[PDB]
Write a protein that binds this ligand. Sequence first.
Ligand code: DTP
Ligand code: CA
Ligand code: CA
Ligand code: CA
Ligand code: CA
Ligand code: CA
Ligand code: CA
Ligand code: CA
Length: 901
Amino acid sequence: MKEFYLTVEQIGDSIFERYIDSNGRERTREVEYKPSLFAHCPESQATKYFDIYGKPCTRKLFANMRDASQWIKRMEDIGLEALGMDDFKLAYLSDTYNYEIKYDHTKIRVANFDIEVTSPDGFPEPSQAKHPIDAITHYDSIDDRFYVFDLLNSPYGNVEEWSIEIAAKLQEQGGDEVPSEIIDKIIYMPFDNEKELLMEYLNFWQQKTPVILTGWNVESFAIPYVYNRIKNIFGESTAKRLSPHRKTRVKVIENMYGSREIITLFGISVLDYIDLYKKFSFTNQPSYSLDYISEFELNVGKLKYDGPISKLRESNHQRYISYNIIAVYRVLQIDAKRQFINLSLDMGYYAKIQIQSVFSPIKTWDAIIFNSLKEQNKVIPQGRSHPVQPYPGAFVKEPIPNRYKYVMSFDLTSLYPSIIRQVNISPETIAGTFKVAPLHDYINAVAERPSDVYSCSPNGMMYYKDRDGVVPTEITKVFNQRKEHKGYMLAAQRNGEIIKEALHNPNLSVDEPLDVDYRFDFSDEIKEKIKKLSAKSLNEMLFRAQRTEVAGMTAQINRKLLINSLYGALGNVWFRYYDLRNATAITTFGQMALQWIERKVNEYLNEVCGTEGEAFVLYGDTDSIYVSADKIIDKVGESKFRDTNHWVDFLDKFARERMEPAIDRGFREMCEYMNNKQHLMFMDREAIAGPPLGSKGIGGFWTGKKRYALNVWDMEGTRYAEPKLKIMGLETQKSSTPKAVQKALKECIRRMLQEGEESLQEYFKEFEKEFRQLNYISIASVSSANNIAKYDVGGFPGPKCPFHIRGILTYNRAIKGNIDAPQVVEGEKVYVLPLREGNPFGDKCIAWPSGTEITDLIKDDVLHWMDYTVLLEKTFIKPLEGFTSAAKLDYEKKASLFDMF
DNA sequence: TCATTAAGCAGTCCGCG
DNA sequence: GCGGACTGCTTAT
Ligand SMILES: Nc1ncnc2c1ncn2[C@H]1C[C@H](O)[C@@H](COP(=O)(O)OP(=O)(O)OP(=O)(O)O)O1
Ligand SMILES: [Ca+2]
Ligand SMILES: [Ca+2]
Ligand SMILES: [Ca+2]
Ligand SMILES: [Ca+2]
Ligand SMILES: [Ca+2]
Ligand SMILES: [Ca+2]
Ligand SMILES: [Ca+2]
């Protein structure tokens, strides 16, 4: 096989590399890598190295990396550009792996671990590590085994061995329901003292040294705790054995309002799964406890135990250990679904970076671009210092608040990366500037043509047309990869809808799910077989289809994220190719493009309907437009349609055969106007929305910018078995909104869009009557909790104290003295509830850590003093009044003349 | 929450005769 | 009460 790196580090004048050799063996080497950097040199000197602007460079070969680093400094002292890759390990990887890396994940040791620490006096601080580690579960991807290190003897209690037999039993038998598919994969090791446990763990670690190290909060808790505990017990040199190169560093993580300390293990790639989840999942969750995320992702039930976690080991050690094993497994189950490890390896090896650098699009793109240029013997510029400056973004149209019955939306494919490619926007393709007219003048095609030579953006920037810049070239490659995975995702989605239809008529038989690739549209034969399957098989197939769709979603949306972040990096001062001219050239071009096509679509439709000045485009945001289709439907007349699917077909056909060609013509004209390199403005029909045929549903509504709801029948070629609510920005979509209120508001919207005013009034009336029964957690608001200290004045709200912070302070007084009650953690999330006048807490609200039950001694008081009236008005009625006043509907029946009888 | 602009709403503080 | 100046937080893109 072709070799690939596993990890790479720089330690002084040495590169330390762990790699897979041509035989599949993991190896490690120390290499005295001699880096090269570059300086400009006279034109009259023969060279093969040129900077990105075509200026000649001389290569400087250094005896060692420290010499290269010192040279960079002296070049700053002289005031001359020191060119080339200054991150020497990236240069090492580029020299060592000078081909497209083909990796084999089955050779990469992925470790997933979790530790338990019994602590009576509150949260066990990883920097102190004053309490024994009493359980470690460490899953190894190469062995496919869960290694369980169990401490039987502690200052906090001596316990019996964990029993695998009881762990396997159902909870109804007194067991722990450890999933049977992992029972045989458990290797259990009990220890009668902590020192031998940790010593054996380190020997184990040495034998099976993680390459990828993951788990849940392992970077902030598990790793620093293990490291510091071993340090406290044995000394530093022993703790450093967690690094295969025996080097570690306490790294300070600086945010906006303070800092925390992580341990950097040289030669390990730490990908904390919480951090992967936050970056790649595209969710915002009310809580990030493993129980909460597990329930959300896998629909598995919460890990149930009596009493505090600090008493679980002594009271029920059996369950203590089993829950530790399950926690590690749940992360593996999340990854099996979401596939973020796979994604990280894909991206990491593509860019030729340390795998942990996938969190940084700036680092990722710096390495892609460097490797690309190096192939042509071109030399990257030195990174420079820049002040942070604001710059303009996307255009968002102000919509008229209203109901909108029939809506068809159109959308530009991967807009900003398409703009980069169309205009040819790159650091080295800048050709000059032109005198800019007001944007309006370009939108309306009255401004002078910017250039007859160069490719232009309406911000005044001109670009070369003779050859692609490195940014357009490299963005296209990832764009094309994305397209492939998006294809699989959509096929899987369309396949899901076929199964859902079939499920309406399941066959009474015993059979099996079909062995099929869900990434490809089902053949006619597969469709025929599906129509004969039982519910059991169909549901299994549905689960598999939806799993395939999720996998495709991960692959496509995060490739989209990486390419959009290249645009974003152009506006980040730390990016090597930071340039606000280029960042603004993209956004301004986008502003023109959207408003240009709004004008074109209006003109086209006014033409077909024989009108003038009618506004068909009701809304747009960045890259997409929403067109009122009422007049199109009215032109054939509703009574002419057989069913809903009939007008959806008609609108689908009108969009594809009439509107898309007109939209294309508009954009091709715009391309010529800006003299762009290549026409890449591809705007296709996105959504078809409207009420069910012959219903009183309103179909859709806008309340404002970034706030709307549509009843969608077809989305990007997926024809849904059941209409799907597309709701953007409204309270149903916000993590801050109580769970039960999201649900209620969503049902209110469903009724508005599908059934109409009367149905909405029925539901509202019932919700208002019953809501006081809802579980307190489900009706709690959620908020992140920053700067608690800032607003804490002697335990009371200081000036300008936010409502949620006030709640936390109330909570802190209620639990005062109690080290055992959960503390609210700065920067994490809290549930928030209002409190009625004259309550014992002495304030108008209380807040406690999210994803948790509030502590028992104050729970009964919270439940007794909860202000349901304020809760209802703030979270439910206020937003609903916003939806209904926009839609010109009443959520409560107005009095009529019929009330006389 | 270490990690690539537009614009909405909640809430504080305070003016608005 | 609302709405502007402002902080805080959270979405859409
Ligand atoms: N997370 C982000 N970071 C930077 N720019 C973004 C981000 N999300 C969106 N944008 C910008 C760049 C996008 O091209 C543009 C419109 O985004 P969006 O509507 O999500 O889809 P898209 O047009 O980029 O891709 P698609 O092909 O899926 O439509 O807005
Ligand atoms: Ca735990
Ligand atoms: Ca788009
Ligand atoms: Ca699209
Ligand atoms: Ca059937
Ligand atoms: Ca869009
Ligand atoms: Ca098209
Ligand atoms: Ca009480």
